[PDB]
Every structure is written in C-alpha cells, then in structure tokens.
C-alpha cells in the first residue's frame, strides 16, 4: 500500500503489519501487535496512516457491531464483498453481480442518481459450532 507522502519506517512498518495478517482489526489491535513485535509506533500515527490508506482505498474498512472501524488489506483490488466470522475474524472474498444489478434496478426505479451499497454478511464457521 504505497502512501502519497515520503515513505518512512513507521509507514513501512504499518504497511508490513497490514500485509502480514489477513483478518479484520482496528487501530488499537494493530498498534498492540506492532508495539509487541518491536515497532514502537504511535496510535495517532497509525490512525492517520490508515485514514490516508482508506482514502486511497488500498485497504478495506468495516464498522463492527459496536461501531468501531476495523481494517483489512484485501488481496483483490476490484469491487468485492467480504463474508466475515466474528468468532474467527477470517474474511472470505465473495462477489456477486446479482446484488449489483438489483441495486441498479431499484435505484433506476426510484429515480436515484447514485448508489453506494453497504453490504455485509456475518456468520459462523462449521468449526465454530463444533467443540
């Protein structure tokens, strides 16, 4: 995830941390993990970096049930949706043109100019049910 400004070891470290993992996580959790592995990087610094990255779109955002935003550097850059298990945190890249066509159709029927769909599916793995 290249940054608009000059690259610095803090930005490189947070980028390495983002690409290191695949689950969704907030600024606090990634701050914890980077400090524990030996980065010593600021909370507001990582917050600003992920704000800039989300503005660039290199990472994907998701508001949890409480409300806090979690972030995930997704491999696929095209339009896509994520199936997320809260017990595991794993994200599966799922995309369907049917929902996009439905959104376009309902927007046209209602005469709406632009459509910005917010779709998320929350579930549990089969292993989660098993003990």
Known binding positions for Zn(2+): 60, 74, 79-82, 85, 88, 93, 95, 100, 117, 125, 127-128
- Cβ closest to a copy of itself, residue 8 vs residue 122: 122
User: What six digits make up the tokens of 33?
Assistant: 């993990």
Q: Interhelix angle for 9-20 vs 43-56, to 10°?
A: 70
Among 87, 92, 106, 115, binds Zn ion (CB under 5 A): 87
In the bound state, the residue with its beta carbon closest to Zn ion is 74
In the bound complex, what is the minimum distance in angstroms from residue 87's beta carbon to Zn ion? 4
Interface pick for a copy of itself out of 12, 43, 56, 115 (rule CB under 8 A): 115
Residue 118 Ramachandran class (φ > 0 left, ψ -120 to 50 alpha, else beta): beta
**In contact, 121 and 81? CB cutoff 8 Å:** yes
């Amino acid at each position: 995830p290249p940054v608009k400004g000059r690259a610095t070891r803090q930005r490189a470290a947070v980028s390495a941390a983002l690409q290191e993992v695949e689950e969704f996580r907030s600024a606090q959790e990634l701050h914890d993990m980077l400090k524990h592995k030996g980065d010593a990087v600021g909370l507001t610094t990582v917050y600003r970096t992920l704000q800039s990255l989300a503005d660039a779109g290199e990472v994907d955002v998701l508001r949890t049930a409480e409300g806090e935003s979690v972030y995930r550097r997704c491999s696929t850059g095209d339009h896509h949706h994520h199936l997320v298990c809260r017990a595991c945190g794993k994200a599966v890249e799922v995309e369907g043109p049917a929902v996009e066509k439905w959104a376009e159709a309902i927007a046209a029927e209602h005469g709406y100019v632009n459509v910005a769909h917010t779709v998320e599916i929350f579930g549990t793995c089969a292993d989660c049910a098993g003990a």
